[PDB]
Amino acid sequence: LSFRMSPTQKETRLGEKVELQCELLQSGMATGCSWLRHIPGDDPRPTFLMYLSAQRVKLAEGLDPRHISGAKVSGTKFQLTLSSFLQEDQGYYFCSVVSNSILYFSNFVPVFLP
Amino acid sequence: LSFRMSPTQKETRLGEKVELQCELLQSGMATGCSWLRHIPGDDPRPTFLMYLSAQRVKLAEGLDPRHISGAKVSGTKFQLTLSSFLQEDQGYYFCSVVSNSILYFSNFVPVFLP
């Protein structure tokens, strides 16, 4: 499964809104999509952020919905929004879709401060 | 020494990721591999893009790792990735390997816009 990322990278600033989108290049394989991010550090694992579908956005435990959310824009377009960028928001953002029990990952989007 | 290219060709779009792979079909001949490009026009010469190996990717001087990179992914498989396709990324991509002072070249992979 292929995705197009809009934008493909972002240099942001503290306090700024950041809006990311991933677009599935094929439809009908899933109704939902997850956003994840990898935080630079010694832990190589990604961090689950949210699951987006026809239902309300489901945020990862402990996340502030005032700060981070997302939306299913269409059957193939998914959006993530950071309302006011914080230092800890820096990382590599990507989408994941499960289809036929296979985890697929979009390309990653580096979102960093100067 | 022969190469297998995956894919053999690609029609891309602006802002899409492009991932190419070339696999050496004979083991034990080289542990490194170069990606080159040919663009018809004013300079027919093979243009060096990167040398992949056990070491970090060695990009040609002037290339931006935020746009172009690659990786050695097995003993024989080598990959080139464009993060966001640009008009200027169009052309014929191919791999080259040296073994016992003998230069080898893969088939050309056309990567173009509609």
Numbering used by the authors:
A (entry chain A), B (entry chain B): 2 to 115
Could you pull the original sentences from the published paper?
Here, we report the high-resolution crystal structures of chicken, swine and bovine CD8α and confirm that they are capable of forming homodimers. All of them are CD8αα homodimers, and each CD8α exhibited a typical IgV architecture consisting of two anti-parallel sheets.
Three extracellular Ig-like domains of chicken, swine and bovine CD8α (cCD8α, sCD8α and bCD8α) were crystallized and diffracted to 2.0 Å, 1.8 Å and 1.8 Å, respectively. The two artiodactyl CD8αα dimers also have some distinct structural characteristics, and the most notable feature is that they have an additional A’ strand. The buried surface areas (BSAs) of cCD8αα, sCD8αα, bCD8αα, mouse CD8αα (mCD8αα), rhesus macaque CD8αα (rCD8αα) and human CD8αα (hCD8αα) are 828.3 Å2, 979.6 Å2, 928.7 Å2, 1048.7 Å2, 1105.5 Å2 and 1026.3 Å2, respectively, indicating that they are tightly binding dimers. The BSAs of sCD8αα and bCD8αα are similar, but there are six hydrogen bonds in sCD8αα and only two hydrogen bonds in bCD8αα, indicating that CD8α dimerization does not mainly rely on hydrogen bonds. The Q residue on the C strand is involved in the formation of hydrogen bonds in five CD8αα dimers, but it was substituted by H in bCD8α, and no hydrogen bond is formed at this location in bCD8αα.
